[PDB]
Structure formats: structure tokens, C-alpha cells
Symmetry: C6
Subunit: 29 residues, 6 copies
């Protein structure tokens, strides 16, 4: 499904955002 | 299903983003 | 439902992100 | 609906995140 | 419906967040 | 669908946010 695909792509991007935010948080410390 | 799984994975990632944002806010 | 629960947990996390971003924005004012 | 309510609350929080990010972006300049 | 409207408003807010993040990245 | 379109536009914006966050993270390395 187009919706199923979109949700999968959002999940992937959110995982990448979570990683980058942790990098920023550690990089500020 | 696949949608239920995707929503669960998004919820998990958003919880992790919320924690990291709090760490940035405290770190600043 | 599992979807209903997931959406509720996303709403909760988004509220927490919104709070932290506001704290950062104010904290950059010093 | 619980889903309808959740989506409304997410939309509200995303609007607030958009505002705060713009504040940070301007505050960095 | 209400869900379709909410998803449209989320899409709009995410576009605005994407622009602001790019401004921060360029500003840094 | 309107929902299908909205989800696609969210996916696109989230990919762009992910890119910008990576740029910030690397840019904080200098």
C-alpha cells in the first residue's frame, strides 16, 4: 500500500532524526 | 499489521527524540 | 487498538518535543 | 474518535514545534 | 474528513519544520 | 487519496528534517 510505504519511510526518517538529535545532544556536552 | 508496526516504530523513535531534545535543553 | 495506542503515544511524545523546543528557544535568549 | 483526537493533538504539537524551530533559527541569526 | 484534515495540517507543519531546520543548519 | 497524499508529503518533509539534523550534527563538529 502507498500508506503502508509512507509509514515505513516516516519510521525510517524518525529513526535517523533520533540518531542525529542524540549526536547533537552529545556534541553539545 | 505493517501499519500497526510502523506506528509502533514511530512512537519509539519519537520517545527517543523527546529524550534527546530534553538533553539538548538541559545541556544549553 | 494498537494503532489508537501508538497515535496516543506519538501525541504524548510530540507534546514533550514541543515543550523541549520552547525551552531551547527561551534558553537561547539566555 | 481516539485516533481523530490523537491526530488533532499531533497537528497542534507540530504547529508548536514549527513555531519554536523558527524562534531558534531567528535567535541563531 | 477530520483525519484527512489533521494529516494535511501535520504535512503543512512538517514542511515549516523542514524549512526552519535548513535555516538553523545554514545559520550554524 | 487525500490521506495517501498527506502521508507522502509527511514522508518527504521527514526525509528533509533528517538531512538537516545530520547537517547540524556534522556542522557542530565544525
Amino acid at each position: 500500500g502507498e500508506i503502508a510505504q509512507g509509514i515505513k519511510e516516516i519510521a525510517k526518517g524518525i529513526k535517523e532524526i533520533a540518531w542525529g538529535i542524540k549526536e547533537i545532544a552529545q556534541g553539545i556536552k
